[model samples]
Target: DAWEIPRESLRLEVKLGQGCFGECWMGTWNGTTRVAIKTLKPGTMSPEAFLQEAQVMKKLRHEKLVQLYAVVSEEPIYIVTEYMSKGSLLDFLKGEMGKYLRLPQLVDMAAQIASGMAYVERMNYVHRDLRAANILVGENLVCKVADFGPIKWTAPEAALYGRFTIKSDVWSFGILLTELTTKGRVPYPGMVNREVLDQVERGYRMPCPPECPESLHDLMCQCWRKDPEERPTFEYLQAFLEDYFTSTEPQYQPGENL
Candidate 1:
């Protein structure tokens, strides 16, 4: 049956902005729970990719992953995902609030993302396009990776077929960590993909902002190693952050400015 959110249905109220890969409208369904309604844009890519994403998401579940509620397939494809009331990491970092995200908080955020990403990695799936904008910061400082529009799935004959691998995701995950540390700033501002790749290849790193601690700065650089094989796996990254935070007291609470 075709799923529909009736016109002006009070069932869910639209909120957050959309994503570049898809049109995402945030809404609240079931009276209390929030969700993001994702609709695929026309001519974005082949149906194969879209279906692959759905199939992959259906089989994966993690605390850091935004839960998939339902799928509406009709003229316009719609996917209902867990709504993150606090919005994207970018939106959250734009305010005076960002200053309060100290080391412990940042570690928590990165740990959640890495752990969630690891969950998918265990199944041989890689999120090819990980970034802060794709991470959702929910209430109570819960960080979850959202927007699975760019996941690359490995096929059975991936070696011969030359499909995406977990390493590709490791590279992007490094970028995601860098973005979070820098408060949503990319390596080079106003640079195209080719230029960014060129700079990265030449050993130019995404500038770590003054706020990010030296430990994280070093980790981010390690993650972005030119050779994917040299990059630390998400498992290692997760464990690193977990230990780093668990050893410390809750230095700061969510929503409190430092």
Candidate 2:
């Protein structure tokens, strides 16, 4: 198929399933290709806004970001991405062997993700909705940032309303890093979103997981700082991860790489 999805070729399927906002389903095409299709019910927001976001993803090309393959604009619009078999980072952490992942392995994966985000950062974009659930892991522990529905073009004034920014993405990355190392534990157990926000407003920060190395813990905390300027750029984090992984020996679990 061509890079653009033709309007006349759009197809629809109704399968009620679990999703973030509303019910969504699996969309398939070309017999073998599959993509997750989400149809936001009316009264949520303007569908035009969703299409604008879809266009943004269509124009973005980066290894770390999910590729927006195409979108169907007929009734019940859809946005498509490459089929990721392993699912989200959160799901993986909940699966078998999740308990076995150690700090070293988590660090290696974080480095890979940092490299990807660095590439995105260089392009002057922001992944507004970055989180563990949006990151997909494939073979060889490859990590790809998924879900571009919330991405926003970087702008000075636009940064005010919980919009996208490099700093926010870093914050999300820090949350994911903490979650990965701690195996999906809430940053503050039993804390509601309001509590979390209040703490954030008061400069309270997410705690690094127990057993996290001092260096890594420090980096995570820096990313979560209320003062966004205190966070390191993706490029810096990428370089650090590269050097760290290169100098460190693999502390693999028994029968891990065989």
Candidate 3:
């Protein structure tokens, strides 16, 4: 909790991208270690928000989730986390490199993030929002859920009344699955977020992507059940995708892990 990193120890290298409340930067700790830092923009949110996020990050240290190393609340309010070499999964899915990802690999990626969400659920944390853009990729295409909070990706009840729960995360995870099946296209393509919410309220879910595997798409639908209580838990998703990834066969190359 007392992880105040001195500003002098951090040397900002270059801007990575603009995030929810600030600019994400590729920086170094004491100029000796590589790290990613998120800097809160002026008047974006209260300094207390940084403290909350810092605490959240520190409490979450899973391989499937990004790791928080330190925080600098001095004016800049930098949140330093593990540097993810491949950046966001959303971008990766859109890139040419992602164009070639086979069915098993896509399932592997989903399995990877589900493992992270299962851990988050055990920690009693509701992601509030979950999507491909919120997932980060490390070396060897390792996928990890970063941070999320989006109206378009949020559960209906949560988005409607601001009521979030672990079940709410399941709904978001369903939307995130659409991202994976669609190869990272914005959810509800051609429709606005407002329309998405309205349609979802009317019990409509996005149709399966043409390229999506049938089994995975069916699982995705389970996450979109009208009643949150009817939705599958992250733990269920973790085992389903993991086993499905292996059940398909030929991806591992005769017992040799990739």
Predicted model with the maximum lDDT = 3
Assess every candidate by TM-score. 0.76, 0.79, 0.90
lDDT of 2 at 9: 44
Of the pair 1 and 2, which is ahead by lDDT? 2
Report the lDDT tens digits of candidate 1 across residue range 25-115. 8776667776677767766655556755666667777888988776755436666777777877877876556756765677778889889
Model 2 stretches with alpha carbons more than 4 Å out: 1-22, 42-45, 148-164, 246-258
TM-score between candidate 1 and the true structure: 0.76
lDDT of 2 by residue, 1-258 (tens): 245466444344546355544455656655567666566655565677766777767767877666777776655566666655566778787777476776566777788889888988888877776677778887766788876342221122224465557888887787777778767665667776556556666777655455565566777777777667777999998888777645543443334311
Model 3 CA deviation exceeding 4 Å by range: 245-258
Tens digits of per-residue lDDT, candidate 3, 105-187, equal 77788889989999988999877767887899888889998773357788888887878988888888888887776668888
Q: Distance from true position, residue 48, model 2, in Å?
A: 0.9
User: lDDT per model, in order?
Assistant: 0.66, 0.67, 0.80
Report the C-alpha displacement of residue 199, candidate 3, in angstroms. 2.0
lDDT of 1: 0.66
